[PDB]
Every structure is written in structure tokens, then in C-alpha cells.
Design a protein around this ligand. Sequence first.
Ligand SMILES: Nc1ncnc2c1ncn2[C@@H]1O[C@@H]2COP(=O)(O)O[C@H]3[C@@H](O)[C@H](n4cnc5c(N)ncnc54)O[C@@H]3COP(=O)(O)O[C@H]2[C@H]1O
Ligand SMILES: [Fe+3]
Ligand SMILES: [Fe+3]
Length: 213
Amino acid sequence: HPLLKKILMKAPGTYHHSMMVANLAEACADKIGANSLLVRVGCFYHDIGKTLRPPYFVENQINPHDRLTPEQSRDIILSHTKDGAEILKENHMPQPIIDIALQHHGTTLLKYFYFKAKETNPDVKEADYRYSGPKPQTKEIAIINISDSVEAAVRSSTEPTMAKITEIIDGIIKDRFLDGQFTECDITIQEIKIIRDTLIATLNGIYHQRIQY
Ligand SMILES: Nc1ncnc2c1ncn2[C@@H]1O[C@@H]2COP(=O)(O)O[C@H]3[C@@H](O)[C@H](n4cnc5c(N)ncnc54)O[C@@H]3COP(=O)(O)O[C@H]2[C@H]1O
Ligand SMILES: [Fe+3]
Ligand SMILES: [Fe+3]
């Protein structure tokens, strides 16, 4: 598997992140009866677009964005879905793996740099700081979108207790619902609740369970 080792060698922080997302998303897919094998493998590759400029993504970092404008930061980060899909395409990967790379942020807002730009232009359009999408077209991809955000959010949190983990997850699911990111797939509100509880249980295992005979 040349591609997966390319992520490992060029972007080991990203590599590590993707394996962790794969475990969380697979658990969720299992629990609602979705395509868990597809979810696992698609997570391996979802961030491969980051291999083009590894140090401009925080998990691979000294921050080179300090010497960049919001617009420049934006152009680099928003590209990684498109570039990832392009790489997988050129490497003749299965289409659903390619779709995961392209759609895993749906059309979400790149909040940090959006608000950094809004500091000096109150008229900045959200449109200019959103991924191109498409919005997740399947349950599997909705699952990945949430799991990816939860992994990263909990990993950067200070003291992720159960309550803290629960609040992080609920906040992400709230934002994705309100922002309409799941209106183009078949995921049910009950399934979202099952995903939420599964992520809570799984992260409880990962962050707090004593490993014992
Ligand atoms: N504390 C938190 N609370 C709630 N949600 C959270 C969170 N931390 C991360 N997320 C979510 O997790 C996503 C991680 O996306 P990715 O694995 O491509 O990893 C990130 C990361 O590699 C990079 N990145 C984001 N902000 C950065 C910054 N200020 N400096 C350097 N790299 C950054 O760009 C990628 C895409 O970022 P984006 O923000 O669109 O997407 C974020 C965001 O939607
Ligand atoms: Fe990503
Ligand atoms: Fe990711």
C-alpha cells in the first residue's frame, strides 16, 4: 500500500489522526448497521490531500500560518479535500474512497480563519471559507464527518472527562444539524443518537478505561 505509507512518511501526525478516526467511525458504522469496512478504509485515506503541504496542518507541526494571510491559509486548507480526491483518482482508488476524501467536511465553514479575516473585513462571506463539498451523500460519510471532528476536538481539549467529552460531541452534532450538513443523505435522527452514544462509550474506553485482566 504505497499511498498509506506516503501519508505515514510525509505526514505522520495526519497518519496517526486518521487511524484514530478510523477506529471511532468504524465503531459507529457497526452500531447502526452501515458499511463499517468501507468507513474504516475510507478513514485511512480521508486526509491524504494534506501530504501536499504537511506543515500547514497543525497535527504535523512552529506555525507557518503566522506568516500567512487568512486568504492564504484558507486556500491551503480548503484544498485538501479536492487534492485528496484527485490523488486517489489518479491512483485509481474505488469511487466511494474518493468521495470520502472530497465530502468528509461537507460544505462546513473553516471557522478559525473565517473569523480571523472578519477582523479586518466585517463583510467577509462565509461562502469564501466553506469547503466545496458536496455535503455527505451517504450515512457512512456523515459518520466520518462527525467522528473526524470529535477525534480532533477531544484530542485538543484540556481535561476530557466524560461530561466534557459528551459536551464536545453534542456541540459538534448541533452545529452540523443547524448548518444543514446532513440533508442530502438518509441518516436518521435516531441513528445520530446512536452515533453520539457510541462515540461517548468508545471515547470513554480510550481516555478512561483501566486496562485489566
Ligand atoms: N476544538 C474543536 N471543536 C470542534 N470541532 C473541531 C475542533 N477541532 C477540530 N474540529 C473539527 O475537526 C476537523 C478536523 O479536520 P482535519 O482532520 O482535516 O484537520 C484540520 C487541521 O489539520 C487543519 N487546521 C485547522 N485549523 C488550523 C490552524 N489554526 N492551524 C493549522 N492547521 C489547522 O485543517 C484541517 C481542517 O480543519 P477544519 O477546521 O475545516 O475541520 C476541523 C473541525 O471541523
Ligand atoms: Fe480533513
Ligand atoms: Fe481529518
